């Protein structure tokens, strides 16, 4: 019966590796020392465009949104590999992904961050924390709360096999508004929570109450998400130069 | 068999995303139209009085109010197709300008493909299938509004005879969006590679779902010629409206789609 939880752990690890090119293992190997191009100022950014692929702060934010949409499809694919997920009411699958992707993006973004900056373009670049802080308000305070979260999150020293199960727990949240059949969602999350618990005991025997400490980080995650939504409004309200091509507006 | 297993998974994925993106499926449309039902029975608009009463029953000039109404729903349909497109594996990975190009030229061919699901020889479901507007009433509309819908009906009765279900249409409308032959595409090869995979997916789906339908795949692909022609006539008809009805307002998103279209 513990054998089924190990099978679930391995299953989610295998699907996580398939769905996400840039693992934490890979990201960590880079961040510590195929060296990446560093963006530390406007001049290094300008030259960066030759491998990054009107105003600086707006172009960066927009680029980030384009790449965020690419990640949502990777997470959607991963979600369909979670035992029981596709058997749920189709409206509930949509609800769980709509509310879940933001929490997952910031969880996985921590894998790409240290206190000094963040890997960009599947590890091709490194944009410095200071450069992002240096953008004219309100763009200068967008990434900073994410860095704060990442520093505290990365102190848990989770690996990819741990994060694979954790991400599944996030997706199967029974408290998303508008859910029609909460029972099988909580029943799957119960099984994932059991699998995560055993994973963290076996993988981190020396790490006392790591399970508890990880679940507590959900608080921080949700604050980071609501804070981003609120700052997305300040943009929509007061930004004249944000108006993209009407058909691009639709995709985002 | 392992290769064909990945094509079944792609068809599954696309159908699943089709159900999520499109509130009114062919399956629901046909259940309303084939008049089996007591709860799903539509109110029928066939004349002015039934249109007037339809205003209370369903939730300026007549021909204009109907045309302004189709405009707004077309916009809402562009939204649904755009949401579907994002779900097609590889689409959001493509160049940003090419994503815009594929949608610009693709959405109207998809609108008319899926409008067929809502049509029989006698008329078309309106207001999410609550209403039904007769083909005769639409044809009797003041020139040039009288012949906007008739070419869609002509296409629909022929297309509908292929007897495709939603699981077929999900892969077909994906094949339409990933068209490498669109004017102004910067990188064609990555589009063609996605369409290759979609076409394999469609071919196995039509073979498994329609075993006794000879060359249904080839016959479906030929219908893409008919869609192309319906869009041209539609655009020509809009040019006439702009000049004849200067007081009538086209939607910017639709204007942007129509801007320098062939
Ligand atoms: C989970 O990770 C991600 O989704 C991202 C998306 C992404 C990919 C390539 C990129 O060049 C960017 C641009 C990142 C910035 C900070 C302008 C984002 O992949 C990243 O390497 C990265 O830094 C991401 C990212 C996502 C959301 C953000 O708010 C910031 C970065
Ligand atoms: C989903 O239903 C359709 O496809 C349309 C849109 C439609 C929806 C509700 C409506 O009330 C109407 C007609 C408008 C009034 C004010 C009675 C049209 O219903 C139609 O009869 C019709 O012709 C629709 C249509 C046609 C062409 C398009 O490009 C888009 C929608």
Author numbering:
A (entry chain B): 207 to 239, 244 to 263, 275 to 473
B (entry chain A): 205 to 263, 275 to 477
Source paper text:
To elucidate the binding mode of butyrolactone I to PPARγ, the crystal structure of PPARγ LBD in complex with butyrolactone I was determined at 2.1 Å resolution. The crystal structure of butyrolactone I-bound PPARγ LBD adopted the canonical nuclear receptor fold consisting of three layers of 13 α-helices and 4 stranded β-sheet. Butyrolactone I was bound to the canonical ligand-binding pocket (LBP) via three hydrogen bonds and hydrophobic effects. The oxygen atom of hydroxylphenyl group in butyrolactone I participated in a water-mediated hydrogen bond with Oη atom of Tyr327 (hydrogen bond distances 2.6 Å and 2.5 Å). The hydrophobic effects of butyrolactone I were presented mostly with H3, H5, and β-sheet of PPARγ LBD, including Ile281, Cys285, Arg288, Ser289, Ala292, Ile326, Leu330, Leu333, Ile341, and Met364. In particular, the 3-methyl-2-butenyl group of butyrolactone I was surrounded by hydrophobic residues, including Ile281, Met348, Leu353, and Met364, which formed a hydrophobic pocket. On the contrary, butyrolactone I did not directly interact with the Oη atom of Tyr473 on H12 that is known for the major interactive motif of the PPARγ full agonist in PPARγ LBD. While the thiazolidinedione moiety of rosiglitazone formed a hydrogen bond with the Oη atom of Tyr473 at a distance of 2.8 Å, butyrolactone I did not interact with Tyr473 since the distance between the oxygen atom of hydroxylphenyl group in butyrolactone I and the Oη atom of Tyr473 was 7.6 Å. Consistent with previous studies, Ser245 phosphorylation inhibition by butyrolactone I could be attributed to the binding of butyrolactone I to the hydrophobic pocket and interacting with several residues on the β-sheet, including Ser342.
The nuclear receptor PPARγ is a pivotal transcription factor regulating mammalian adipogenesis and adipocyte functions. The protein kinase CDK5 can phosphorylate the serine (Ser) 245 residue of PPARγ. The phosphorylated PPARγ at Ser245 is associated with the down-regulation of insulin-sensitizing adiponectin production. Butyrolactone I functions as a PPARγ partial agonist.
